[PDB]
Structures are given as structure tokens and as C-alpha cells.
Design an enzyme around this catalytic site. Sequence first.
Site, short mmCIF file in Angstrom:
data_model
loop_
_atom_site.label_atom_id
_atom_site.label_comp_id
_atom_site.label_asym_id
_atom_site.label_seq_id
_atom_site.Cartn_x
_atom_site.Cartn_y
_atom_site.Cartn_z
N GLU D 59 0.90 -4.82 0.25
CA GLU D 59 0.66 -3.63 -0.72
C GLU D 59 0.38 -4.11 -1.97
OE1 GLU D 59 3.76 -0.48 -1.13
OE2 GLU D 59 2.36 0.27 -2.91
N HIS D 60 1.18 -4.91 -2.69
CA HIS D 60 1.06 -5.60 -3.75
C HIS D 60 -0.46 -6.13 -3.91
CE1 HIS D 60 4.39 -5.46 -6.86
NE2 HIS D 60 4.93 -4.80 -5.62
N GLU D 136 9.94 -5.96 -10.52
CA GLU D 136 10.19 -4.73 -9.80
C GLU D 136 11.59 -4.68 -9.35
OE1 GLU D 136 6.91 -3.43 -7.37
OE2 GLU D 136 5.37 -3.13 -9.02
#
Lengths: 30, 30, 22, 444, 99, 423, 211
Positions: D59-60, D136
Site C-alpha cells: 500500500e505504501h 508511522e
Amino acid sequence: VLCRESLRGQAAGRPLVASVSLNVPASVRY
Amino acid sequence: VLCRESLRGQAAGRPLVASVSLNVPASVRY
Amino acid sequence: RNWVPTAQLWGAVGAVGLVSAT
Amino acid sequence: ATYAQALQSVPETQVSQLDNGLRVASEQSSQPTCTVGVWIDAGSRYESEKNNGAGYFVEHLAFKGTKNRPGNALEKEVESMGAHLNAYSTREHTAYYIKALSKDLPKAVELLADIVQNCSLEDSQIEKERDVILQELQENDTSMRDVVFNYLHATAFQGTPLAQSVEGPSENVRKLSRADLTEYLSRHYKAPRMVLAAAGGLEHRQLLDLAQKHFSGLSGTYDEDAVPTLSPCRFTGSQICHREDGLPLAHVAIAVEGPGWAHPDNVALQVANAIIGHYDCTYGGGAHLSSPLASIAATNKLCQSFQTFNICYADTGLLGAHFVCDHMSIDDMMFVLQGQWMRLCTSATESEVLRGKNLLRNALVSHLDGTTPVCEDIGRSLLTYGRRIPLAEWESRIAEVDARVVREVCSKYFYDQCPAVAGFGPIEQLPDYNRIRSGMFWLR
Amino acid sequence: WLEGIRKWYYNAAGFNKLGLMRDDTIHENDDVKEAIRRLPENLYNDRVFRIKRALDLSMRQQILPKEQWTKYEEDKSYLEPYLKEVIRERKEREEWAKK
Amino acid sequence: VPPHPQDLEFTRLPNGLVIASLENYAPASRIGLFIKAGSRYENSNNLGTSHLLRLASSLTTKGASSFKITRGIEAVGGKLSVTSTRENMAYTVECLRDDVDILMEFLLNVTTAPEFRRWEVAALQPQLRIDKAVALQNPQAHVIENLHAAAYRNALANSLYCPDYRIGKVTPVELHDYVQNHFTSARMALIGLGVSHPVLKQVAEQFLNIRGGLGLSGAKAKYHGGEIREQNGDSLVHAALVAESAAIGSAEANAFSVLQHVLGAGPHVKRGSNATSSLYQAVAKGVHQPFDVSAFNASYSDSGLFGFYTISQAASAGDVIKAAYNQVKTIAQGNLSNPDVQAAKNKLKAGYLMSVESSEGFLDEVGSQALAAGSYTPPSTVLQQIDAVADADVINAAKKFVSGRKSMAASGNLGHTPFIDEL
Amino acid sequence: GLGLSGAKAKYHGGEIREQNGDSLVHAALVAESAAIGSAEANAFSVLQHVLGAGPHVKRGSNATSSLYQAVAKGVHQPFDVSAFNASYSDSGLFGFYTISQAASAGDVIKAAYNQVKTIAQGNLSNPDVQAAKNKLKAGYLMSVESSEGFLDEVGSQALAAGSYTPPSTVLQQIDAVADADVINAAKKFVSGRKSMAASGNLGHTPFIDEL
């Protein structure tokens, strides 16, 4: 917040707009 | 702080100067 | 409403229990 | 016209299927903008102890240059056309989607197909996203709301896939190789496991042509040997108590084993959670609020917020509640909350259940407004339910629920059941598990 | 018609000899407490003194001079309009809770 | 199967009240009573009165008790909100289609016939300390309060949230009077969605006919130049630097609004590097840290502000603000190609169409226009309005920023964060 | 580290206006005066006493005070105004402080400001300065009378300069200040960049640009 990725979008998108309600939580849009 | 007589002198005579002590009460001169 | 079957069952528990003890 | 008629007159969702396996779904309207996207049965539950964090990394890396559009060309092209591009990863559902003009539909579908199929995965860019995820994960550490929920999963589903966080442990993030990401992609990102959803002013025929022209390049079958299918996860009644007095407010999350996506009971459980409701200190009603837990919590000022949740997965879930409160208010909040569960299990008025239904009725129609929530609903529905469920069908299942159904269902899932409890913050008052477990049945 | 015997009973009650109005002697409960809480500063601080003086009289086993006695005509019903509303709101809450 | 779109009907009453319904055939209804009442129409004395009034929407009315409002709306699954800007107060009700008359009844009771009981208002006083403190966690909010405070003199310098000294001091008489003055026919505008027009008109004639002093030319947004710099001791250094833009009614507003999107408006790609954003790319090449910058554009019916907002470390703020400022100055001198504007227009007009997509944003846009002008102008004409903005208007808007008087506001550790005169 | 000396008193122009909701409206308006070491400091210090420095007579009407008499003739309320003078080893501030009602502040600040501007333009007789010098040099001798004030004055000089200069030389320093220095100091105020600070109900209390 900490890095650059999350810190994006925080800058003022529009003049702030305070919303209060009976049911919904009070928010500050843009 | 009601009349003009007492109100005289309360305008800032000099830059404020904070004094704290062991014995004497803490004051703010001028 | 809902405590009718409960109170009846406890009514039985009390009844049979009092009969048990005596 | 009436509400019952409006539900019937709502645009009917339509679904087609490609030969290679992909499902393609659409909701037509008169609006000029639209949302279109790709939903995938992929995430933390499919991941393993080796490759935990793969779905997140992907996703990153997803929106960084594709094989045919490098670096930030994709980014420039989406931005310059006047459109938004977005993504997420649930424990059971990864998804990428584009919000755009209806005019822009062909390009949007092409860029989605480009992101999914031929991703670059640049090695210099993996080394940068490694640090970004490591930042994150510290950003999530400070968020107490997320930490307590990840702990709830970790202890509710201990020793199983669902216990795993979607982001993954910092060690896996530090050591995750390109071999793992590409193998995770090659396995899980495929046509029969995927859905193409769309919603807005667009023609189903056209979407199907775009999906046929761009997405039919995906493989449709296995190598006969590596097809992962979900083993059911063991729910364990248990507790986790991250004692930390330095933080200002205690967060508690308590839940019992859930129904799973398939179970009709979910509707009655949504009605149930609507009766207990949810509160925040910024609410207007306060002392006069309908749900007694909110009323009691507002009057006495027990908590800052509480929220009843039903997190759903394939064959299980988490049915319960969450609250944020002062360190001297935990026992009381817990007592009122469990008191409300036990009450609803044993005694449930017809009036409050009607309120519970109407809250849910309004929730469904409020949520499916705009294209993005409807496109989500489609993409999620086809992965979970199998088909899109119309609002009339939902209303049939809500109208089905009366007081007896709520009691029979609440008592089924909550009465005399070991709940999974997660506490983070100044939690010295958090009741003992035996006392919590004693509160899960009644005197009665 | 019987305003006479009402006025007789007022005098026969005797709280007026202590310099109390009728609503100073009302038995507190959840409604009255709430009505008394709703009172504005002046009427609250007055009833405070009227009661504080009446208790001080009751300690000494005495009453006020005859002119200082409360008058049936000048006996203001200061608490009623609030207490009526508190009761009506409670009745409404009960009537709503009934359904 | 695609359903037919119906025209947004429109009626303006003789007493001045603007009405507008859209028969949606939707499952839900969505009704709003928009009013020219807000932070600006407060004055030196009665401050935070709009904030308390925003909070007090569920207090006892003349026709319905506070208990009845809360429980009656909740029992039908509805919800009654209030959304304040600096100019407008938007009382909005949402519910199912069969429970309209009901929500409308409560809406009218709250907006036309509130009681403001002394004890209820006194009980509500500490809620605005909470509601303020909740929103002020977002440092954006406080920087914008300080910006408007420093930018203007009297009108829009009024804070949206209540001043801290006025917490507890707002009276029930001030609320009474603030309603009586501002909640009036020529200043109000009733919007509807998922509802028939005749009943909405008849209700608006029958109940919403109350007219008083303060109608309605208005007050002067006296623009000024100021800087208030609040030393924070925070992780980041939030700051903003603006100048007087154009008011919302003119084509200049659209030039500034395009110029916002030419510059870094706000990210579109999740976890992107902000590619097409001008300001982000200008500062990124300069200083190498975690930061964010974006173009801030406020437009009102009286006046407007335009510039940018910067978020950065202690030392980086000095470089970030200058580099962003210089990128505004470089575009001011006709260094702007035609594709940049043509992208920005496409971003803007897409973003506008997306903003009116959800019925909440739609209703806020219909209610915006019903007060601002007293009319409705559908999306297609707004698309034409955007597309008709020349490149010269963008260069003139960008030039008006640099030439015009400056208004700055910042909060953080400001040791290496410049003043306006240091620009 | 460090070793005496110092940094820079970077003078600027600013206004912060704190809305108070108070009984009165306290305010101040100054400009960059001279630093303590020069004869300009003594000119500003005399100019303070030419203007309304601070009352001498208990329950008086502030007779010889210039600013009080200038504002009194204008607006008829309870008020107070006085000349504020700060001098440091690096820099200094000079102007005046005003206390007033909500609406009166607008008039009081302007009328006081105009009375500074009328002195700055040059209306000043020789007896006004000669009284003010006598007030100042008396007030100085009174300030060094008690041993606490004496010690604070000896310690002031020990840091400021690194020396001691006895009262008589300070009396000469005051008496040597020309009328031109007083008019130039008063002129430097009006011409120089302005610094304001106000707190109260400031609805009818002006900005710097409105002056």
C-alpha cells in the site's frame, strides 16, 4: 505529526467551520 | 478603583521590577 | 414482562426450598 | 412518496464477471463526478508470521511509480487531471480507489489496472518507505485509540492471524525483503480474489469494456498448490493491561466473540449497539440522552467518550464497546456498560428497540451518500456478502427485528460469555477479570 | 366565600408570627430542592434569612412583634411558578417514559 | 437503471425570506435554515454569544422542552446540528422521509421561539470551555483565530469560539437579543432536500415570519495589517501569512481560488510527495526536513484573505516561509504557463463538483448562495465561471497579494520564525 | 562564557491588544527613547516630568501635570494618564500610559498624544523645564534617601558603567539638559516607530495606524 508523510494535509484547507450537534461529535471542518 | 482621586498614580511609573524574598512579601515595584 | 418466568422460577425455588427445609 | 417507496426506487446495483475471474460492479446515478476502485481479499489475516506487514508496505509502495509510469508520473497524472487517489488496508480487505470526474472514467480504470498489475517496487524506494513505516509505527504508538484496539485483537484472537496488526511488527518492517512483497503480491493479488467497484454517473457496459480491455490481463487460476483459504480464528476470553499512569486518560476496550459477516444476527446486533449507543463530551443532549449509559455518563461525567462496535470478519468478529475516561471512573463505566448489556439480554422495551431500528435505518441512508461510500459498500459487499444487498432487503431485516429478537440475540452473544478486554493508560481501577466475567451474567 | 376561614387558618398556622411566608415552610423533596435551586439570587438569599431568623426565633421560644408578622394579603407565593414547571417537566418525563 | 434529475426550485417571500427545495425522491430528508448570524455580528461587548447559541440548540423552547427536543429527535433516529461560520449560522436537521414534519417542528421551535432560561444557560456555560478546548487541540484553529484577529479590525476579527474571559459571562438576555436582532426574515434562508416545495413554502410563511432591527446592509470588514505571535513550546511551528484577497461575489474571487490551486492547495494522492503542488516543490528544493505548506484562501460576502499556511521545525520556518513567499512572488511576474492554469482550473472545478456531491455539502452550497446573493446558480455556470478566468487575473491576484498590506499569525517555538517587516 | 557586554535590543513596532472585559481600559503607547548612558536619557527623563510623571499631592487634581490637564479639558470622566519612561544600558522606551472607561480611551489617548505633539512642535516655556528639572533632581535625591534605594542605585551604576558618580554630578547632569534636548526628545517620540499595548474593553480604543 512526526514525519513528513502524516504532516501533509494538515495545513489549512479552508477557513475553519465549527459544527456542534445533538447526536454527532463537535467538529472543526477545514 | 471608583473615583479619579485614587486612580491617580496607578499609571506605570517605571518598568516593572519583581522582588521575591525569604521573609518579605513578593512585590512588583513600578 | 420479562421477570414473569424468572419470578415464577424463583417462586418455585422458594416454595420447594421451604418444603425442603421443613 | 414514502421511505419504503424511496428504498424501492433507489438505483439497482449491477454486477458482471470477466472470464479470467474478476467481478465488475456498478451503481449508476445522475451526478457528474464518480468513484471507481479495486477491492481485494488481502490483508493481515492472510499474512503470516514471516511476512506480517507486506500488505501495508505494498500500500505504501503502490502509488509510487508503476512499471510503465515511473517515479511520480502516476502522481502527477492523477493530480493534473483533477482527481483524488486513495488506499487502505483492513485486516481482511486491501483496497485502492480513484475519485474523479465521470468523463475521466477510462483513464481512472487504466491507472488502477496499472497500480495493481505492474507495480515497480523500486529498491531505493523500499529503503525509504522502510523509514516512513518505522516513523508511522511510532505515530500509532502515541494514538491510544489504535493501540487499545490492536491489543483487543491481539488478546481476543491470540495465537491466530487476526491477532496480527495490519502494519506489522517493527522487526518485520526492518527486515522485509522485496522477495516477500512480490511473492505476497503474486499470490494474493489476483482476479477471482478481486472486485472492481464503481459509482456515479457511468454506464455499466462501459465499465465492463474498460475492465475487459485492461484487467483481463490478470491470471485466473492457481499453480494448483499455493491457494490460501482462511482457517477460522480461535476467540479467547482474556485480558491485556498495559499499565501506564503517565498518560492522561485510561482507554478500555471490552468485547465478546462476534457473529461473522454472513450471520443475519448482525442486524439485531447493530440495533442492539444502537440502543446502548455512543457518547462524547461535546454532545448536546447530555443528561436527557436516550441511551441510559450516555445519560448516566453525561450527568455524572463518567467518561470523555464511549462507542459500541461490531467489528466483523469472515466467520467471527468483535462485538462490544470502547470507552475513554478518568482513572477513577473505570469501574463505574464498566458497571453501567455491562449493566446495559445484561439489561438488553434479559429485558428490552419495544420503544427503545424501535429507536434502535430507526437509528440504524438512518445510519444506512446517511452512510450511502456521495459516491465513495457507495463504491466502498459495493467493493466490500462483493468480497464479504458475495453480492450487493439492496436497502429494501436491509429494511426487511430491520423491520424483522422486534424486542424478543434483540433479547434472544443479545443474550446469545453476550450473556455468560468470557469477553476479550484491553486496557491502556492509568488503569489501576480497571476491574479484575473474574469481576468482569461475573458482570457478563446477572444476579439475576 | 371561605377566604375568611382560609385567613383564619393562616393566622392559626402561626408561621407568620416567625416572619415566614408559606413557601418557606414547604417540605423539601426532589422537586422543591430543584425549584429552590432555580430561584434567582434575591429570592434565594431572602428565604435564607427569613428561615435563618425564624429558626433563631424558634430557638429562643419567641415570636416577632405584631406589626412584623406576615400578612395573608402580602404573603407572596415566590416558589410556586418554578415548582409547577419542575413538576410539569417530571410529569412529562414520566409520560414519555410510559411509552 | 438511471433516475431523472429534477430542478432545484426556488421561491423568495415578500417579507424577504429565501426558500429552496429539491424533491430528491431520496430515502432520507435534509433540511437546513441558514441565517446571517455569526461571529462577525457580535461586537466589543457581547462576545462568544454566537458560540453559546450554537451550543444551546437543544435548550428549552417555548413550544418544546429540552427533554422533548433531545428524546423526540433521537426516537425517530434523527439529528439536529448547527454549523457556524464567521458570517452564517446553519441550523440543520436530518431524518427519514416520514419524520420530516417532526424535525421541522423542532427546527422552527429552536430557531424562532427559544426561551433561554437563566438556569439552563448558567448550566450550559462550562460546555463552551470544553467545546473550545476540544477544537483548539488543532493548532490550525488557533492560528486562524489569531490571523483573522490580526488581519481585520472589528468585524471578522471576532473569534468563532468564545473569548476565555467571556466564559460564564454570556447572559440569557444577550442570547434573547442576539436572536431577536439577527434571526429574522431578510437574514434567514430555509433550504430543503428530499421534500416537497409547497409544504416547505407554507411552513416558511406560517412560522418563519419574524422581522426586527438590523436588516441588513451590514458592517464593514475594515482590513488592517497585523501580526500576533504566540510562543507555544510545541513540536512543530504552525504559521500563516496572508493579504486582502477579493470578496466572494466577483470574478477576482475565482482568480484567487484558481491561484490557490496553481499553488499548493492540498494533497490528492495518499502518501504522495505533492507533485503538482507549486509551494511544496519550491520549499522542498530549498530545505530538507519534515514540513508542510499550503495555499490558504478565505472569501466572504464583504471581504477575503489569501496567502499560505506553513508547518515546520524551529529553524526551518524561516526558510519555508521565505521560499514559499518567493514562489508566490515568482508567479506574480508572469512566469506562469497556460497548462498550469488549465490544470488548476480542472482541479478546482472537479473539487467543486465533488464538494456538492454529498447532500450535506450540496445543502451547504445552496444555503451559501441563498444568503450570499439571494439566488441559485447551478454547477455548470460555476464551471463556466472558473473556465472564463484569464491568466492575467491569476497574475493580478498573485500581484495584489505581494503589493497589498500583510497579515501574519504564528504559533510554535518562533525563535527563527520571521516578522512581517523581515519579509 | 559570555563575559559582560551582550546582544542587541532590536527595536521594532508592534501592537498586541488583549480583550479583557475589565472595569477600566489600561493602555500604553511608546516609541524608542535613548539608552541610559547618554544625555538624551536625561532629556527624556526631564520630558517625563514636563509631562504628567506621577502625582505629588495627596487627593490633588494633578495641577502641574501636563498630560492630565490636556485630557481633563477634553473629556469629563474618572481617568488617569502618566508619562512612562524606560531606559536600559542597551536601549529605552518613552511615551505614556492611559487608564480610562470603554469610550474615553479613544479621546484620552489622542488628547495625550496631541499634548506630546504640541510640546514636540515647540510650545514650551523655560519655567516648565526648570520646574521639571527641580522635580526630577528632588525625586532622584529622595530615591537614594532610604538605604534600599541607595544600594539599588550603587548596584545599578556598578553594572551599567563599572563606576560610581555621586548625586551632585547627577544634579549637574540634570541641570545641564537644554530645552532643545527636551524638544528633540519629544520630537523623536512622534517621528519614531510606535509600540502599543492595551488591555480592557477595547471597542473604542484605537490602533497605532488610527493615531
